[PDB]
Amino acid sequence: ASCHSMSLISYRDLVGVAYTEEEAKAMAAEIEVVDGPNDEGEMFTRPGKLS
Amino acid sequence: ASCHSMSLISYRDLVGVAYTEEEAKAMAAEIEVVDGPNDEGEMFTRPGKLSDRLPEPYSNESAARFANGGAYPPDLSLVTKARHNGQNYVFALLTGYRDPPAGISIREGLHYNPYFPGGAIAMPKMLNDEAVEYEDGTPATEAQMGKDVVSFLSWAAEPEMEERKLMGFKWIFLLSLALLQAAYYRRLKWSVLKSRKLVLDVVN
Amino acid sequence: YDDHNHERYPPGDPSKRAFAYFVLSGGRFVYASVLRLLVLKLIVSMSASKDVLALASLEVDLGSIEPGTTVTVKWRGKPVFIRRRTEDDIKLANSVDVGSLRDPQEDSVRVKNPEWLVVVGVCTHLGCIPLPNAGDYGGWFCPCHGSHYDISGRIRKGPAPYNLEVPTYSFLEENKLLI
Amino acid sequence: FEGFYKLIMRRNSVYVTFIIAGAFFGERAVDYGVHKLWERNNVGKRYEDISVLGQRP
Amino acid sequence: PVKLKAVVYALSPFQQKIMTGLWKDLPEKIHHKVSENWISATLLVTPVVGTYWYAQYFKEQEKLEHRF
Amino acid sequence: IDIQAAAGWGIAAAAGAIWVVQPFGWIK
Amino acid sequence: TIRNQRFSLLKQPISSTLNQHLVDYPTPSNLSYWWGFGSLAGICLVIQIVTGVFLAMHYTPHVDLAFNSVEHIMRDVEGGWLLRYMHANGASMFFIVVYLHIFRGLYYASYSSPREFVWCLGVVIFLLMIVTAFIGYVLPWGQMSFWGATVITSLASAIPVVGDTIVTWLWGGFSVDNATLNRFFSLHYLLPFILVGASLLHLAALHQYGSNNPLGVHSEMDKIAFYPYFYVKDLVGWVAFAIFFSIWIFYAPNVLGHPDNYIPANPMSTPPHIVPEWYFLPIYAILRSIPDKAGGVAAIALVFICLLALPFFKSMYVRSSSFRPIYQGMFWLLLADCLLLGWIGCQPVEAPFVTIGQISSLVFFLFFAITPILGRVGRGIPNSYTD
Amino acid sequence: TIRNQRFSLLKQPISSTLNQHLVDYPTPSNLSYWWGFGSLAGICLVIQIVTGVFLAMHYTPHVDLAFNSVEHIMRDVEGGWLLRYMHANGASMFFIVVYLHIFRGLYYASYSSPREFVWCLGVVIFLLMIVTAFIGYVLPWGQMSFWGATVITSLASAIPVVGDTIVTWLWGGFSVDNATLNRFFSLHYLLPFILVGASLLHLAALHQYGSNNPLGVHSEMDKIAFYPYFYVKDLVGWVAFAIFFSIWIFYAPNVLGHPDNYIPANPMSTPPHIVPEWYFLPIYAILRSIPDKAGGVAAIALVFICLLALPFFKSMYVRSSSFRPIYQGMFWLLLADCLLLGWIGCQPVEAPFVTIGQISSLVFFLFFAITPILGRVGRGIPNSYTD
Ligand SMILES: CCCCCCCCCCCCCCCCCC(=O)O[C@@H](COC(=O)CCCCCCCCCCCCCCC)COP(=O)(O)OC[C@H](O)CO
Ligand code: HEM
Ligand code: HEM
Ligand code: HEM
Ligand code: HEM
Ligand code: HEM
Ligand SMILES: COC1=C(OC)C(=O)C(C/C=C(\C)CC/C=C(\C)CC/C=C(\C)CC/C=C(/C)CCC=C(C)C)=C(C)C1=O
Ligand code: FES
């Protein structure tokens, strides 16, 4: 993963295949996903989710 | 342009309409456009070209709302087509900031405008005398500037109007000639039937 | 004859056939013009859009590479080939009979530099990109239909009728090439 | 005169050629007249009637 | 096939005038159109125009009664 | 009626080609 | 005759069906210009199909690009503004010519026996036309497109048990979004070919018995060939329609629509005046009149039930309004009522328009309620009006 | 008999056309299973249309979204994998069935009089199928899609004076880009409907005279109704085809394809091996066997010229290969040659495959050159083989 993307795979895809839902949820929470813009109009960061 | 975007218009659209190719080229070269990525993967800026669109004043809709009291200044590319009586409405709203009727109070941050629905607008009045300097020398009065900007907005919304009108005149004249011919053709074909004398025995 | 709708010409009068052709030719002019207009509008709507034509002119710069390898670079939708050739490479490229070539052209004409070979890398046959370091002549090979190009980009084997197109280019000092 | 006027009425190929030519010339003549009257009706409003056309600064 | 007995006389299209009939008997044409169709024209125009005018009057009265 | 007709229809086809496609400038 | 040699080429098997169904088909000699609107409808269908096929080469069915691709057609495609205006105004033209067709049918009782199946096919064609034009109006993805899609896809929620399930299935999600637009675009390419097939079946069913005429009588003794007489008669109407269409295209391209569809779709705000195209206005007024969702949907379906049941009502044997003065007056009242309903649909939901719409929908349904009793009463006219 | 009362509903005007064209149509009793492939091809066409309509609900024809929209069909929409595998391998099934159909027609000389028009309409249908399948293969916007579109649109450049302008008109620009993909999408929705119409015309032309039979003889003395006998025979064929198609769909969904199209289109790099779908490979081989642009395009056109001119050759009066030993042997050689051309199209353009491709193309054209000579000579068989 340090060099190859897997842009087609979501964290929800692993649920019921290799991980429980809580396991994949914590996995996604470990990463920092960009999001926004907020009400003030800036891009920010949030924990990753299953989607 | 300080607060309104015109994202459907590009500098090449002005050529042959209001500026020469070189004039629009220099005007585009006076702006900065985000380009990239370069070979190292990093974005950069460059002077604009003819094909570049008009620059946006804000990064996104939320940033526009935050800088304007929460109200979003709409894109003006199709404004004259996007409101009923668009040209007249825009001219009247631009030149129609006046004091509210007795018994009407406007909350802080808004300004009264009877042409605007509800009456309270979040846009301040910015068409004021001598707000612009005109290269041609015509006095930049409020009405002059409003008329000129509505003319520009009318063109921007409907850039095909002149070709379309030139086509409607030629084709309605031609199709009317064709209608005359078609009437003559139908009547000529049907005359043998319409003038015929029919003899039968019945009476009632 | 009933005359409510049409009144007859007096008996013994010549036919109006030739008058009627003239009135009818009149409107047939317009019908043909309308057909032509509608068909041509439909056809021209598929031609290149104004914005597509807008992005049809630009130039870029380049750097340098090792003596004997190539690097493709980018343009409109079209690769551009760069190949600095060696001395033995020039010896090979300057020993082919022009008469035997289907597109007679010498290497010297195609190149603005003795060893730097710059050429548009699109097959002249049907638009594929010819693979470098491949073929029967140490130049390029187009996989699509088997077109072989020599080190100078001249077609030598295959259906392609032309050599690879040389674009306008120039140097700046030693390592800045403007296409 | 009479040669063409006898060919047009007697051979349909010549009549079709006459129709095509008439369409071509009539459509061009109306395009021309419609543009002349358009130019007359809009004096001074053209892109090339701009006085400062060519001096942006 | 219906068994028909009739005699039909017809004149060639190239021996008669094609367009003048448009403007012949014109008063008769107008009179027939008006006299046969005025009831239908009334039955079509009256409800639409009446409903429209009544709606306009209602709107004007409602607008006035809400003023001060 | 066979050669004259062929010539006439060829002339009509050529005129129609010149009318549909109008390459006034390709006379080079 | 023994067909040893080839006679006229039109009678050869290569063109015999086109000669018999299109060239030599017998037609009542007294057909008026009101009988020229079926062909106009067909030409409108063809115009829509051709212009839409060439418009689909430039349109992108994605919420981030649909609006901008429609503006890219207007602005960048050579001839693009003409493709769009012809298609958009073509849709209005189709509805005008089809409404005139339908009311021609109603005035002359063209739905009556033996042509009931023709009328039922026509009603199915009208349904297909409505679905096609609606989903087409959503493609631009403006304000009107988005909110109009939000209502008609919610009409299934009138169903108690599965209504919400049907709404969320048609949406492809929990809101009107990209899935809805993509599926609308696919349906909107497909439906016109089903409309072409339905029109072909319509014409075949009509040609089983031939056309009715303004007198409403049996016409075998005075029939003539469709070509060239009704060909030239229809050509006059075609050229006049071209003039009308050209006026709309070149001089009033946007007066038939609303300016609100030039605003990109906003699921947050809602336009204060959410209207459909003018040709759906009477239906929308009849739906708004009933102060209940389920009742409104039932009334909309009852409209088409009444249309389908009209041919089968026991009636009198006279067809033409030319000899049925009371039915003639009912027809003119119905036409005024439909125009009133269309106008009311454009009005906001507020007095006095609510009551006016309720009365107008009531009168619309009274037309169909009263026609059968008129037939039953008028069956006794020949006994009563003797010599 | 006088039809005062109603007999079978099948003979009523509501159903009479369907009855006489699909239930009671006289059919030679000795038709073999090689006569079920027309119905199989019709079923393949309906399968393609249904799956493609449902897939167009989720596909986005934009260069930035098309590949991702396919992947989203495969991963996100329920049963999407099935819909895609069904459309992609149904194209292959369509071509397998149609090729078997064509070679049946060739073996039994079904193209001969009086069925020449049937064969010509079939040739037109084959051209439509080729265009449809190719532009459909462009839609995923993989490497194969982009580069195949490049070469096929470039084919027009073989014309000396106006070839470049045609190429740039087809592209909508100076390169294969979003305009190409969007116009290819519209064409892909449209062409299937024209295919349906052409197939209906094909069927009508065939029912002018009825089907040919394995003996090639006049069959009027032993004909039976299509329903139920050939219905149940075609049903056996439909179930067997379903098993075949299911094997492809569920267990080998990607064997009839190239992995390169799972790589997003890269306009910079042509893949080392660039080939069309397998059903186009023989035409690929004939194209590449000519060491000349214009020669290759002209050979491609000459293939269809020969196919169209086949029914009009002055031939002997014997149809079936079962009674024509020389033509039968030549047919089997032609089948082997076509399979060889398909295999050669998959090979890189290098020795020994250039010579093999050239010889195979020559043999393919020799079939059509030699059949008329065979007919002229065999005209003298009944005078030389005396009892
Ligand atoms: C794709 C094009 C290929 C190009 C090929 C290049 C040019 C070659 C063209 C000739 C075609 C090659 C194949 C011809 C031989 C076919 C095999 C054959 O016909 O042998 C028969 C044997 O009899 C013959 O036909 C031999 C005849 C030799 C040729 C004599 C020529 C004189 C006849 C001229 C008549 C011309 C028209 C004939 C129409 C059939 C089969 O006998 P049988 O099947 O009835 O039973 C025996 C077997 O054991 C059991 O099945
Ligand atoms: C002369 C230059 C301008 C023109 C022609 C113009 C035009 C318009 C128009 C047509 C509207 C929409 C009215 C409607 O909803 O119907 C509008 C709204 C708005 N404009 Fe401008 N504008 C101009 C300058 C500005 C400037 C300089 C600002 C900011 C300082 C601004 C801020 C806004 C805002 C915030 C709105 C939203 C108002 C609301 O919803 O209440 N405008 N303008
Ligand atoms: C796509 C739209 C339609 C097309 C193309 C179409 C076409 C036609 C055509 C060509 C005819 C024969 C000629 C004529 O009288 O006009 C016809 C007749 C008829 N159509 Fe339609 N039609 C359409 C929609 C409808 C609808 C919606 C109805 C009614 C619900 C309808 C009812 C009829 C009837 C009753 C006739 C017989 C008319 C008579 O003989 O007097 N049609 N149609
Ligand atoms: C197979 C035929 C057709 C195709 C491929 C097609 C395609 C399209 C496309 C791409 C658009 C979006 C671009 C635009 O809005 O201008 C559109 C819009 C539309 N279409 Fe169609 N269409 C077809 C037939 C029809 C028919 C038969 C009708 C009428 C019932 C119709 C009614 C509409 C309407 C009302 C719009 C919205 C127009 C607007 O306001 O911009 N279309 N169509
Ligand atoms: C109107 C009917 C049709 C529609 C709406 C349609 C639609 C589509 C769509 C949306 C795609 C892109 C999605 C994908 O790649 O799976 C596609 C691909 C394709 N279509 Fe069609 N199609 C139709 C009929 C046909 C027919 C008749 C054929 C064969 C002659 C065909 C052959 C193909 C092929 C080969 C592909 C590429 C498949 C792949 O590798 O993924 N389609 N079609
Ligand atoms: C979509 C493609 C096609 C469809 C749906 C189709 C349909 C049919 C059907 C149903 C039959 C009658 C039953 C049968 O003989 O199997 C038939 C017969 C026939 N077809 Fe096609 N066909 C197609 C393509 C073709 C092609 C490409 C050709 C030749 C180039 C062709 C030539 C013939 C011939 C000659 C017959 C007569 C067979 C005989 O009487 O023995 N067809 N077709
Ligand atoms: C003697 O008779 C018969 C045959 O021997 C000659 C046959 O070969 C067959 C079997 C094969 C047939 C009919 C193939 C038809 C193939 C076609 C036209 C391809 C596509 C099919 C479609 C879409 C049907 C189009 C028809 C209509 C009316 C459109 C509406 C239909 C639908 C919505 C599905 C049948 C049933 C038959 O009896
Ligand atoms: S594209 Fe290069 S040889 Fe065919």
Residue numbers in the entry:
A (entry chain E): 104 to 154
B (entry chain O): 104 to 307
C (entry chain N): 93 to 271
D (entry chain S): 13 to 69
E (entry chain Q): 5 to 72
F (entry chain T): 18 to 45
G (entry chain M), H (entry chain C): 2 to 388
What does the paper say about this structure?
Protein complexes of the mitochondrial respiratory chain assemble into respiratory supercomplexes. Here we present the high-resolution electron cryo-microscopy structure of the Arabidopsis respiratory supercomplex consisting of complex I and a complex III dimer, with a total of 68 protein subunits and numerous bound cofactors. A complex I-ferredoxin, subunit B14.7 and P9, a newly defined subunit of plant complex I, mediate supercomplex formation. We propose that the main role of the plant supercomplex is to stabilize its components in the membrane.
Our 2 Å structure now shows the bound, co-purified Q substrate in each of the two Qo sites of the complex III dimer and surrounding water molecules in close-to-atomic detail. Both Rieske head domains assume the b-state, with the Rieske FeS cluster positioned 6.8 Å away from the bound Qo, and the FeS-coordinating H237 of the Rieske domain interacting with the Qo head group via a 2.9 Å hydrogen bond. In this distal binding position relative to haem bL, electrons can easily pass from Qo to the Rieske iron–sulphur cluster in the course of the Q cycle. During the cycle, protons from the quinol are released to the cristae lumen. In our structure, as in the stigmatellin- and HHDBT-bound yeast complex, one proton can be directly transferred to H237 of the Rieske head domain. An alternative, longer path would lead via Cyt b Y280 and the bL propionate group to a water cluster surrounded by conserved polar residues of Cyt b (R85, Y86, N90, N255, Y263 and N262). Either pathway would enable proton release to the bulk solvent without involving Cyt b E278 in the Qo motif. However, in the Arabidopsis supercomplex, E278 does not interact with Qo and only contributes to a water chain via its backbone nitrogen atom.
